[PDB]
């Protein structure tokens, strides 16, 4: 039940282990039945800001005149 | 939590396309990038927004309460669960209207002799009992309620690493409301003014219940005080409807204000 | 049992750790979610929405609705600035309290491009051309249109499209700037001048307001979460 | 330790100074000793006297800074606000930074 | 074009020749409750055309001295035809809205109105007692309320007003008004448009709620750039508000609710 | 971190190739080996340079600060983060101009009664809060800043193994500069001498922020002092541009000198 | 839970340990690296670069630029040494402060070959032959050219190629020597003599300097990291 | 001897790990020989209440007359 | 031994935890079960049985 | 996610385990998501000192005359 993800290496050691292998991976295993007990995975996604930045009914191009 | 787009090189322009001109009346923000108004070079973007994700923004244990017990009714204390007793976490949560997450509670317990040269006591054990709205609240530091046959309790031994427990999403709605524009009651026509009156913006009189804390050891005449600092961290976070942050000092559980109403300093219009 | 060895750091409490812990309310039937409109995934989404800038912080206007209004008039052409600002999004008093500035105050570093949009609120009969400018740090802050015109600038012609956007490109020495006033990571100057002049016919108001807006571009990012000075608690 | 006496009228016209004295005990002397001033004030988040090595004017053009800077002293620094209009209060703060404990002061 | 539109709901039609597009809040169009998000088990009532139509609330007048106006939904529509009837006869109710604000002037007038739709628009009170505003004051109905230029604490202990004291630059809630642009909005700048149109989906932490106890949306109108004309210190232009509920469905029918007033 | 080459046997020579002669004016070092100037035998080399790798050279926890708090404003202390408060680690880092690495911080906490026969206190808990440049600095040992809703804090219980945390590469440049030949400001022509003046070799006035330390327990009239010794170890190390090491005593954060300017002893030219 | 047994060494803090620990600033967006010139991978790379030796530590010359200059002259041939040194790279005052000596003072053991390069800074019209020598320990330190010539030596003829290198081979009993003055691990003696004599024509300077350089060979290594005595801190 | 079960995720993080993978599983291993030492699995079944709600000999339909 | 790091929550006693513990009476010959009538699996089964309401709470 | 490397055995025990097998290997597993939390692998590489020892434009042979 182990989950193996890879790390985003910031500072690199003068090793090939700093660039590949299990040496740039980390392992995770959940010990509790309730999902609330789990830690945060932090592999979180993003989205389009459009719902806030452009909640416009009739879609407009920036090059084209906004007021038409 | 990802990458940002590269800057593409952009040369001069002489066209009928004018991205610089717009009309903010529509309610939209002009999605311009540097290459729209100036000549740019190609830049391979390596910066990411990994730390500004909703999760990383809240992934910190914030203090929400400091419960105090004097082991010489103060032999036990009760804290009504809330995030509004402090200001820092509260302000961050209020960037959004609704939220849904799990909670991690860490308890930092400290104690000391009030007297520099008097008294002595053996190591203390604390009991932190959660009293869900409806359960009997302790009247004495040692009455039957402390049997916890159903209420969740945490027994902490002084000096041990801070205690910590996780709580699931416990709301009775599909999300926690940071703002509730309403009442719990509707006054009906004909009833006395004393009737149907309730607080504005309040839901249940007892939303999440409270914590009852006490020292389990038999109290000695020695003067001692303990403080349990409660730290809470939202994990597995989802939030809805952004709102402008609090600009003036908080004045209670509501959006009420009173004191620091002039937050901005003076600065000359033409002064850099 | 299995032989173990306790390493330094044991029994400590790091406020920013990420571990598992026992659930105090096991087998709880969690209320399922519903699709509520307006969900947010990243704080940077909020920094990309136009927010009105309190440009007029003069003693009589600060902390009133007038702090947002910058007045123009049909006077003959002048080379003096209409407004001046420093590119310190988290610390300049005029930028520090916008939605963008509020978010930047929860972080120690910022990087990326910004854009300033100005809305003309004069009558339809009013016309005019304005010069919006951005001067990277290092030289004297522009005090005349002649100096401002030598840096990044957009000549705004007023008409049907009521607003105009000027993008302040990311021109920096360091890979990230600090959210505090610091000369090492200084950003430059923003200023506005009259290109020609505001002209109105008879029976038309000779003075009108313009409103400014600021938002982050798609290459904007912040890092190192910190506490803001914008909220306090006495006792 | 912090011992600021500045509760000053303050005369208008103007102009007068806005001092800040931090007398230093006494066998555990203070560095780094940069000095910050935050107004009170729509502070989001600047109208600041900050002084790292060379005195830096965080933009309130109407300021005068008089401390033996670019070297060190340390800080019993005096500020001055001219002028000359009633850009009033509100309030002002005076916060220092220290290698020992002193990234702190008093409003 | 972006400027000419026609909205038809039920037996009501609205035309405009000077629009600036329309905003659909959070990009969500109003909809009915899906079976997977349903809660009350009883068969809902859906008045449809009888309730989902354009209702014109009272016209307010904009002057150089105006600070702003506010309304609460569904509150402002509680006395509107069959929509109000269904609201009071049912324990639970849900609805989205099409808000159409109207304001025409001339080519020699100036001014800009910021029209914001705020979910859970909680306003600040007038006393030192927290959350003291009483039901009757929080729910003004179609006449709504107004913003003030400053906070004034109610000191009458014998007869507290128990009302709101929404200061304009503080957005009536302790936040800076310039940041209110994070909420769905449009701007009626007199030199550009006649109106503002916002389509609001149902927003709440529940699928359905009590319409009498809870107001889902708040409509705030603030003069961003004050009204000015030629040389007439004296200038008044009306602002009419027309709102149409959408996808109305009610649950929990019983005897009618008659709330206490004034 | 590897092997050294073997010595190959070398016999006598009588040739026009003269590796012994050279010209150091070119700026190069003569790459001679023993077999170039003498007769050698074959030696199978087994020694390696495993311990002199840049990583192994720095792989040690060095003391960079001793923060002191007197639990009877001294109830809390603030330390501006730096590696120049001590000399040993500083001198090693300065063998290079630029560096890039992660950091491991270990905190050794000690405390004791000032009085041999007076006072008593229960076990202490410490809070080490990191205040990133910009965050509010504590004014009192118990003001709102200690809520740490966003700042990273470490709560240490006296007597527990030393606390330890890791910090990523946090520089705003692509590498840390051990030397900066410049200023943070450029004085412009016309401005007052008070204007545009800054320290030579200084970048930001507040590079990395500081640490605020305090004892969380309520202070007792008892006289107590605690000291937090901060140890830092660079891990995942990369360094650029070697420089000669510091020969004379340090005189501040800069390359300034004043006192021990005559480091070398006397020795006869013809004395072994 | 899983039964464990704590072994001795638990809860200790070894200054040279190598364990993992929680990150205090999670999800931090690290600034990527750039290819900066002059990167170093091993400290021994620095020990292989020629560094000037302060050979003249006489009272008037030590701690001045003159400590690096060893003067020669056109006097008639003499069998007395021009300079004398002991092969104690980390402890001999003349070697202890070179780049090589500085690095050796951070280690307890050293092994390998060394090379000494001498630069002739006389005029072009000056000629001469010199004998550079190395005598492994155990006998009397050479005091005449006659004794020096019996050990490892290079006869340097001055001309176009201005410099001459003498390699001091690794001749030791132990596998590693100590970086302190200790007889058990003593290294021997280095000395220089005139083979013929320095000769110059008329109108030419009769005295000139030579500079010495020292660096490690490719078979050089050090071990056991320790603290140097070359840096201290009072109070 | 590890038992890998899946959790019933309540609050979901903005990750795909919150919806799939070993990140929504938990692992269990018994360390003791006596079953009494074991924890509770909590993967407990339900049943028909009929033995209590309708302990009737001659089964009856709700639509049909109970007294026939 | 294997290097470990103690996390907060260590040595605490959560009244609602679910861990394993050593058996104080090992190898005990447990009496097997018999099929007793009326077994219950969920508390909600009991809530579905008609129970008489005390409707007349007059003094 | 375990990384198995081999040790460089210095002192050898009078065992065959001191010369082969998993007995001369060591195992590693990363427990943290951030690479900063990782220990140093210490399998570090070396390089050519030439950039410092011979930063000469026109490459020269030691046997051949440096000044040509
Ligand atoms: C929108 O932001 C929110 C929403 C809900 C919150 O509190 C809900 C809540 C409900 C129950 C418990 C009970 O938790 C505990 C248990 Cl079982 C046992 C022991 C100790 C505790 Cl502590 C704790 C918090 C908070 Cl603090 C912020
Ligand atoms: C070239 O050599 C350098 C470069 C940078 C350095 O310091 C950078 C630095 C930045 C932030 C922190 C903050 O670290 C901490 C945190 Cl998050 C939480 C708790 C405690 C600490 Cl301690 C610590 C050091 C040092 Cl000491 C040497």
DSSP B121: -
What is the resolution in angstroms? 9.0
Residue E94 within a domain: yes
Evaluate whether G82 touches G143 at the Cβ level (below 8 Å). Answer: no
Query: Exposed/middle/buried for E87, CB within 10 Å: 0-12, 13-18, 19+?
Result: buried
E strand or H helix at E224? strand E217-229
Could you tell me the residue range of the domain that residue E57 belongs to? 5-253
Burial of residue B136 (number of CB atoms within 10 Å: 0-12, 13-18, 19+): exposed
For residues F214 and F67, is the Cβ–Cβ distance under 8 A? no
Q: Do B188 and E260 form a contact (C-beta atoms < 8 A)?
A: yes
Cis peptide before D32 (omega within 30 of 0): yes
Q: Return the SS3 of F232.
A: strand
* DSSP at A13: P
**E strand segments, F81-175:** 96-113, 125-131, 153-157, 163-167
Asked whether the CA dihedral E210, E212, E213, E219 is positive or negative, the reply is: positive
Return the H-helix or E-strand segment holding A50.
Answer: helix A50-53
Return the residue of B nearest to H11 by Cα. B101
Inter-chain Cβ pairs, chain G and chain J, closer than 8 A: 52
Beta strands F153-157 and F125-131 are: antiparallel
Q: How close does chain C come to G23, measured CA to CA in Å? A: 7
Name the one residue in this structure whose structure tokens are 């703002």: B179
Token code pair at residue J7 = 């040790």
Residue E77 CA to residue E215 CA, distance in Å, equals 11
Percentages helix, strand, coil for chain J (3-state, rounded to 5) are 15, 15, 70
Map tokens 């530091």 to a residue. B141
CB D99 within 8 A of CB D30: yes
Q: How far is CA G96 from the centre of its chain?
A: 7
Q: Whose CA is nearest to atom 4 of ligand 1?
A: B176
Tokens representing J20 are: 């082969």
- The whole-angstrom separation of Cα G9 and Cα E198 is 69
Give which of D44, D103, D51, D101 is closest to D75, Cα–Cα: D51
With an 8 Å Cβ cutoff, are G30 and A11 in contact? Answer: yes
Selected for mutation to probe chain F from D53, D101, D102, D107 (highest F CB count within 10 Å) is D101
Q: What CATH number did the domain enclosing H31 receive?
A: 4.10.80.10
Q: How many domains does chain A have?
A: 1
Q: Would the CB atoms of E213 and B171 count as touching at under 8 Å?
A: no
Return the C-alpha torsion angle B194, B196, B197, B198, nearest 10.
140
Residue F144 contacts residue B88 (beta carbons within 8 Å): yes
- Report helix, strand or coil for E3: coil
Q: How far is C-alpha H37 from the geometric centre of its chain's CA atoms?
A: 21
Residue pair D55/D65 in contact by the 8 Å Cβ criterion: yes
Is J3 an 8 Å CB contact of chain A? yes
Q: Please spell the DSSP secondary structure of G27-83, one letter per residue.
A: T--PPPP---S-EESBTHHHHTS-EE------TTTTTSGGGG-EEEE-PPP--S-SE
Cα D89 from Cα E224, distance rounded (Å)? 26
Helix (H) / strand (E) element for C103: namely helix C99-104
- Among candidate residues B183, B204, B200, the one with its CA nearest the CA of residue E259: B183
User: F171 exposed, middle or buried (CB, 10 Å; 0-12, 13-18, 19+)?
Assistant: buried
In a domain, E259, yes or no: no
Q: Which of B98, B102, B103 to mutate to test the pocket of ligand 1 (most atoms within 8 A of CB)?
A: B103
User: Strand, helix or coil at G104?
Assistant: helix
C-beta separation of D33 from D105 below 8 A: no
E253: number of Cβ within 10 Å? 15
- Strand G189-194 and strand G114-120: the pairing is unpaired
Distance CA F19, CA F15 (A): 11
Tokens for I54, please give them: 């005390």
**Cα(I11)–Cα(I17) distance, integer angstroms:** 12
The encoded tokens of residue F120 equal 């008593």
Domain of E113, CATH number, reads 2.60.120.20
Instruction: Determine the straight-line distance between the first and last CA of chain J, rounded to whole angstroms.
Output: 58
Secondary structure class of E89 (helix, strand, coil): helix
Instruction: Using the CB atoms, write b or e for E157-189: b if 16+ within 10 Å.
Output: eeebbbbbbbbbbbbbbbbbbbbbbbbbbbbbb
What is the number of residues in chain E? 262
Query: Residue E45's CB: how many other CB atoms inside 10 A?
Result: 17
What is the helix, strand, coil percentage profile of chain G, to 5?
A: 10, 30, 60
Judged by DSSP in three states, G22 sits in: coil
- C-beta separation of J62 from G167 below 8 A: no
**DSSP code string of I1-59:** -EEE-PPTTTT-EETT-------SSTT--PPPP---S---S-THHHHTS----------
User: Is the CB of C24 inside a 6 Å radius of any atom of ligand 1?
Assistant: yes
Parent domain of J61: 1-68
Q: How far is the CA of B208 from the centre of ligand 1 (A)?
A: 7
Give, for F158, the enclosing helix (H) or strand (E).
none
Neighbours of A59 (CB within 10 A): 9
Phi, psi dihedrals of residue F58, rounded to the nearest 5°: -100, -10
Measured torsion, CA atoms of residues I12, I16, I22, I26, in degrees rounded to the nearest 10? 160
- If DSSP codes are grouped into helix, strand and coil, which group holds residue E96? strand
Q: Are strands E195-200 and E23-24 parallel, antiparallel or unpaired?
A: parallel
Q: Which of A68, C172, H13 is nearest to F172 (CA)?
A: C172
Query: Measured between alpha carbons, how far is C39 from C102 in angstroms, rounded to an integer?
Result: 20
- What span, in angstroms and rounded, lies between the C-alpha atoms of B62 and F147? 6
Is the sign of the CA dihedral B249, B252, B256, B259 positive or negative?
negative
Length of chain G measured in residues: 235
Residues of A with Cβ-Cβ distance to H13 under 8 angstroms: 40-41, 44
φ and ψ of F131, to 5 deg:
-110, 95
Planar angle of CA D31, C137, C93, nearest 5 degrees = 70
Q: What does residue C184 show for φ and ψ, rounded to 5 degrees?
A: -60, -35
G200 with G126: CB under 8 angstroms? yes
Please check whether residue E149 lies inside any domain of the structure.
yes
Verify whether ligand 2 is closer than 6 Å to residue F232 (CB atom). Answer: yes
Sign of CA dihedral A7, A8, A13, A18: positive
Query: CA-CA distance, F120 to B117, in Å (whole number)?
Result: 7
Q: Is F93 in the pocket of ligand 2 (CB under 6 A)?
A: yes
Q: Which ligand is nearest to the CA of I12?
A: 1
Which candidate, B103, B143, B104, places its Cα nearest to that of B127? Answer: B143
Tokens linked to H55: 């302990």
Give CA–CA dist J1/H28, Å, rounded.
19
Tokens 């929990």 sit at which residue? Answer: E252
Extract the tokens encoding J5.
Answer: 């490397």
Chain C positions in Cβ-Cβ contact with residue D85 (cut-off 8 Å)? 59
* Structural domain includes residue E197: yes
- The residues of J whose Cβ lies within 8 A of any Cβ of F are 8, 32, 34-40, 42-46, 52-56, 60, 62-67
Handedness of CA H41, H47, H51, H52 (dihedral sign): positive
* E163 neighbors E133 (Cβ within 8 angstroms): yes
Distance between CA atoms of residues E177 and C65, nearest Å: 8
CA distance B25 to A67: 9
Decide: helix, strand or coil at residue F72. Answer: coil
Residue B81 dihedral angles phi and psi, to the nearest 5°: -60, 125
Provide the residue count of chain B.
272
Q: Quick one: F143 exposed, middle or buried, by C-beta within 10 A (0-12, 13-18, 19+)?
A: middle
Of J47, J57, J2, J8, the closest CA to residue J29 belongs to J2
Whether omega before D15 lies within 30 degrees of 0, making that bond cis, reads yes
Tokens 């416990």 map to which residue?
B170
CB atoms within 10 A of CB G8: 7
CA separation for the pair F71, F73 (Å, rounded): 10
Sign of the Cα torsion B228, B229, B235, B238 reads positive
Dist. CA F261–CA J1, nearest whole Å: 55
Beta-bridge mates of residue C56: none
Rounded (10°) CA dihedral G117, G119, G124, G126: -80
Classified as helix, coil or strand, E217 is: strand
The H-or-E segment that residue G100 falls in is helix G99-104
Helices (H) and strands (E) in chain B, counts: 2, 10
CA F76 to chain centre: 25
Residues pairing with F93 in the sheet: none
Residue linked to tokens 């029918």? E253
**Phi-psi sector, G63: left (phi>0), alpha (psi -120 to 50), beta:** left
Does B157 contact chain I (CB < 8 Å)? yes
3-state SS assignment for residue B35: helix
Experimental method, per PDB record: cryo-EM
Closest CA to J32 of G21, B208, E242, C146: G21
Phi then psi for G185, rounded to 5 degrees?
-115, 35
d(CA C119, CA E186): 13
């Amino acid at each position: 039940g182990a989950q193996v993800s890879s790390q985003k290496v910031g500072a690199h050691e003068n090793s090939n282990r700093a660039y590949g292998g299990s040496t740039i991976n980390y392992t995770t295993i959940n010990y509790y039945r309730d999902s609330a007990s789990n830690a945060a995975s932090k592999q979180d996604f993003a989205q389009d800001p459009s719902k806030f930045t452009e909640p416009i009914k009739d879609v407009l191009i920036k090059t084209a005149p906004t007021l038409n | 939590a990802n990458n940002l787009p590269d800057t593409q090189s952009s040369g001069p322009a002489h066209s009928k396309e004018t991205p610089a001109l717009t009309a903010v009346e529509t309610g939209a923000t002009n999605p311009l990038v540097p290459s729209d108004t100036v000549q740019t070079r190609h830049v391979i973007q390596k910066r990411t927004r990994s730390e500004s994700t909703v999760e990383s923004f809240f992934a910190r244990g914030a203090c929400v309460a400091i419960i105090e017990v004097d082991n010489d009714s103060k032999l036990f204390s009760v804290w009504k669960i809330t995030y509004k007793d402090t200001v820092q976490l509260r302000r961050k949560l209020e960037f959004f209207t609704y939220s849904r997450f799990d909670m991690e509670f860490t308890f930092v317990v400290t104690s000391n002799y009030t007297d520099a040269n008097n008294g002595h006591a053996l190591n203390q054990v604390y009991q932190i009992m959660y009293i869900p709205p409806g359960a009997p609240i302790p009247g004495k530091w040692n009455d039957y309620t402390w049997q916890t046959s159903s209420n969740p309790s945490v027994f902490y031994t002084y000096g041990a690493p801070p205690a910590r427990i996780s709580v699931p999403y416990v709301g009775i709605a599909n999300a926690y409301s940071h703002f509730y524009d309403g009442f719990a009651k509707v006054p009906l026509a004909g009833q006395a003014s004393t009737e149907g009156d309730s607080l504005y913006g309040a839901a249940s009189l007892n939303d999440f219940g409270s914590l009852a804390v006490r020292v389990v050891n038999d109290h000695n005449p020695t003067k001692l005080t303990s403080k349990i600092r409660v730290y809470m961290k939202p994990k597995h976070v989802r939030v809805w409807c952004p709102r402008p942050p609090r600009a003036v000092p908080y004045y209670g559980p509501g959006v009420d204000y009173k004191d620091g109403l002039a937050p901005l300093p003076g600065k000359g219009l033409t002064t850099y | 049992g299995l032989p173990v060895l306790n390493t330094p750091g044991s029994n400590q409490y790091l406020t920013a750790d990420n571990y598992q812990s026992p659930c105090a309310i096991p087998e709880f039937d969690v209320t399922p979610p519903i699709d509520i409109p307006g969900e947010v995934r990243n704080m940077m989404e909020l920094a990309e929405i136009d927010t009105m800038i309190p440009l007029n912080l003069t003693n009589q206007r600060k902390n009133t609705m007038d702090m947002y209004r910058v007045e123009l008039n049909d006077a003959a052409h002048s080379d003096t600035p209409i407004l001046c600002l420093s590119l310190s999004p988290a610390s300049d008093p005029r930028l520090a309290h916008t939605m963008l500035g509020e978010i930047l105050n929860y972080y120690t570093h910022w990087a990326g491009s910004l854009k300033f949009t100005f809305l003309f609120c004069g009558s339809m009969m009013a016309t005019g051309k304005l010069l919006v400018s951005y001067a990277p740090p290092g030289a004297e802050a522009p005090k005349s249109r002649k100096e401002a015109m030598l840096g990044t600038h957009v000549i705004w012609d007023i008409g049907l499209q009521s607003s105009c956007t000027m993008v302040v490109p990311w021109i920096s020495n360091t890979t990230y700037r600090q959210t505090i006033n610091d000369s090492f990571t200084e950003g430059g100057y923003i200023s506005m001048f009259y290109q020609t002049r505001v002209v109105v016919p008879l029976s038309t108001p000779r003075k009108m307001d313009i409103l400014g807006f600021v938002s982050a571009c798609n290459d904007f990012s912040v890092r190192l979460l910190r506490d803001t000075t914008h909220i306090s608690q006495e006792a | 330790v912090v011992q600021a006496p500045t509760q000053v009228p303050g005369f208008l016209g103007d102009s007068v100074t806005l001092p800040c004295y931090l007398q230093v005990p006494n066998m555990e002397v203070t560095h780094v000793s940069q000095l910050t001033w935050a107004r009170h004030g729509e502070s989001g988040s600047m109208a600041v006297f900050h002084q790292t090595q060379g005195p830096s004017y965080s933009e309130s053009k109407r300021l005068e800074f008089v401390a033996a800077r670019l070297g060190a002293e340390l800080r019993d620094a005096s500020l001055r606000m001219f002028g000359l209009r009633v850009e009033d209060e509100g309030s002002y703060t005076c916060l220092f930074v220290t290698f020992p404990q002193g990234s702190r002061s008093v409003d | 074009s972006v400027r000419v539109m026609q909205l038809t709901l039920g037996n009501s039609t609205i035309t405009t020749q000077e629009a600036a597009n329309s905003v659909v809040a959070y990009g969500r169009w109003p909809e009915y409750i899906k079976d997977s998000e349903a809660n009350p088990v009883d068969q809902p009532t859906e008045p449809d055309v009888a309730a989902c139509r354009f209702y014109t609330l009272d016209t307010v007048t904009w002057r150089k001295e105006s600070r702003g106006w506010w309304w609460k939904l569904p509150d402002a529509l509680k006395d509107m035809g069959l929509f109000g009837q269904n609201m009071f006869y049912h324990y639970l109710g849900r609805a989205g809205y099409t808000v159409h604000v109207q304001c025409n002037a001339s080519k020699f007038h100036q001014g800009a109105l910021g029209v914001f739709a705020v979910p859970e628009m909680c306003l600040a009170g007038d006393s030192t007692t927290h959350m003291f505003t009483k039901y009757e004051n929080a729910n003004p109905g179609e006449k709504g309320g107004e913003f003030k230029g400053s906070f004034t604490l109610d000191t009458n202990a014998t007869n507290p007003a128990r009302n709101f004291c929404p200061v304009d630059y503080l957005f009536g809630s302790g936040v800076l008004a310039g940041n209110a642009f994070v909420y769905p909005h449009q701007i009626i700048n007199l030199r550009t448009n006649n109106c503002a149109t916002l389509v609001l989906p149902y927003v709440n932490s529940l699928s359905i709620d009590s319409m009498t106890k809870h107001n889902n949306w708040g409509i705030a109108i603030l003069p961003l750039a004050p009204l000015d004309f030629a040389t007439e210190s004296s200038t008044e232009i009306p602002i009419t508000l027309t709102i149409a509920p959408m996808c109305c469905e009610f649950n929990g029918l019983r005897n009618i609710t008659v709330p206490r007033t004034q």
